[PDB]
Each structure stands twice: as C-alpha cells, then as structure tokens.
Amino acid sequence: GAPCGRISFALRYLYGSDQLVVRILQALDLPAKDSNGFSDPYVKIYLLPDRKKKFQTKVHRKTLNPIFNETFQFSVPLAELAQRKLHFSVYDFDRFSRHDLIGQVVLDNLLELAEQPPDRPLWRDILEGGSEKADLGELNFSLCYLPTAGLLTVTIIKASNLKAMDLTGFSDPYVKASLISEGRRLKKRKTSIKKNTLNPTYNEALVFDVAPESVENVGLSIAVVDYDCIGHNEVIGVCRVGPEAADPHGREHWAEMLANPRKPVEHWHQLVEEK
Ligand SMILES: [Mg+2]
Ligand SMILES: [Mg+2]
Ligand SMILES: [Mg+2]
Ligand SMILES: [Mg+2]
C-alpha cells in the first residue's frame, strides 16, 4: 500500500484520568475513488483488541486532502497499552453503494508513542491498495452441449455467499453468459433477476447454438452482476471455465463438458475473480 496517501495524527496519554486521547489531524494525497476525480473520505477508529467500540470522523466531501482535527478518548489501563494495537480505517463514502476502503494503518508500539505531546504530528503511511484477497461467493451451473443441432447448454442453478453491494446487506443478482479472448461478445445471455438475496436460485438454462470443432476455444466466461436501479449495475464476480490456467477446475470442467451429454460440469467454481 502506497498510492494510498499518508495521514497525520497526534496522540497523548492523559494521566490521572487514565484515558488515551487521540487526534486525527489530516491526510495527504488520498487516491481518487469517485469518478469526478475526488473522494468523500472519513475514518473509523478502534482499539484493535476489542473490535467493537469504534469511533467515526465526520465525512468530508470532494477532497483528497481532508483536515480532520477531531479528538477521541479511550479510557484504558495505563499498563494495558501492552496487549493493544491501534487501527485506522479510511473509506470512501457513498450514499447507497457499499463503502470502498482506501486504506488502513496500525500503530503497533502503542507504548512508546505515549512519548509526548498534544502537538506531536507524526505522519504514517496509508496502506493496503493493490489487488484481490478476500471472498465474493461462488456460483454453480452445468454445461452440456450436443453435436447434433449444436446446443451448448449453460444452465445456471444457484450461487451463494455473494458479496453485499448495498449497505442494506443484500444484492439483486443475475448473471451474464459470455465467452473470451477471440470475443464472440456479440453473443451474450442474461438470466432472470432475483431481489434481496445472497444465495439466488435460478434453475434457468441458457440456450446456445455453437458448433463442434469450434469447441477448442475453451471459452465461456460468466459473471454475477448486481442490478441497481439507482446507480449502474456492478459485477460482483466472475468465473470463466476457459484457458485460464489459474482455474484448472474450469478448463477440465470444459473437457468433461462432453462425454456425458448433460449435467456433469456441476461442482461450482469460486467468484474471487474481480476481472
Ligand atoms: Mg462515490
Ligand atoms: Mg460520492
Ligand atoms: Mg461507492
Ligand atoms: Mg439495490
């Protein structure tokens, strides 16, 4: 994590009252999440051990260099600073979509910093900002194409654990049927649309008209988009079943996408493919 700017804070350990004061000062060069070029940032703040006593800075609109200047206290046992870290989270802020996380920072040696004083601005880097990592769900379907009239069966049964893209905690799933590399994107196929649910169940098929030899493309990449009326539809995840040596499960799933003219091609794949 680097393009994720830097944030300025100060911290003192008030004595007598045994509280740990913390001041969020400001941040520089935060990334530009929103499209207009800016970001509406704000930061969560909690004492790592107990991940449930958080604090929240006001949000600042359109600016990659917000000036917080907000102080929060944490009544804590003097010597308790031992087993205790400090977590900072900076998220973009949105009104309906899920809040993007820009970066976080961890203040390991909480003790030393007890140093001094209120005015002790001590910059730190905003980390975490590269590629994938976590989950997104995993969809299940069954491929089945017959050489006869040439019908590549792409029946989508269900999927589960889908990522919530709404703040409500849900998503309005549906899936797109497509291919890869060569293109053939001039031939897509969308499923139904199931409201508020992280484990849709379609039991719907996708009628295709492909040919024999043409099956050496090993191409058919599908994705789980989230139908949003407010903003525009976003892809929650994708799979591929194609020449993606990154997912053997699929390419094999392709080879065995014959032999037994239906069903078998079952055994869902992951969706941790953010395309
Ligand atoms: Mg935005
Ligand atoms: Mg916004
Ligand atoms: Mg957003
Ligand atoms: Mg929605």
Swiss-Prot record:
Ca(2+) 4 binds at residues 166, 172, 226, 228. The keyword Transport does not apply. GO terms for biological process: calcium-ion regulated exocytosis; cell differentiation; chemical synaptic transmission; positive regulation of dendrite extension; positive regulation of vesicle fusion; regulation of calcium ion-dependent exocytosis; regulation of postsynaptic membrane neurotransmitter receptor levels; response to calcium ion. Keywords: Calcium, Cell membrane, Cytoplasmic vesicle, Differentiation, Disulfide bond, Membrane, Metal-binding, Methylation, Repeat, Transmembrane, Transmembrane helix. Brain, various endocrine tissues and hormone-secreting clonal cells. One of its GO terms (molecular function) is protein homodimerization activity. Ca(2+) 1 binds at residues 34, 40, 92-94. Ca(2+) 2 binds at residues 34, 92, 94, 100. Residues 3-124, 135-269 form the C2 domain. One of its GO terms (cellular component) is transport vesicle membrane. Ca(2+) 3 binds at residues 94, 97, 100. It is found in: Cell membrane; Cytoplasmic vesicle, Secretory vesicle membrane. Homodimer; disulfide-linked via the cysteine motif. Can also form heterodimers with SYT6, SYT9 and SYT10. This is Synaptotagmin-3. It comes from Rattus norvegicus. The gene is Syt3. The chain holds residues 295 to 569 of 588 of the full protein.
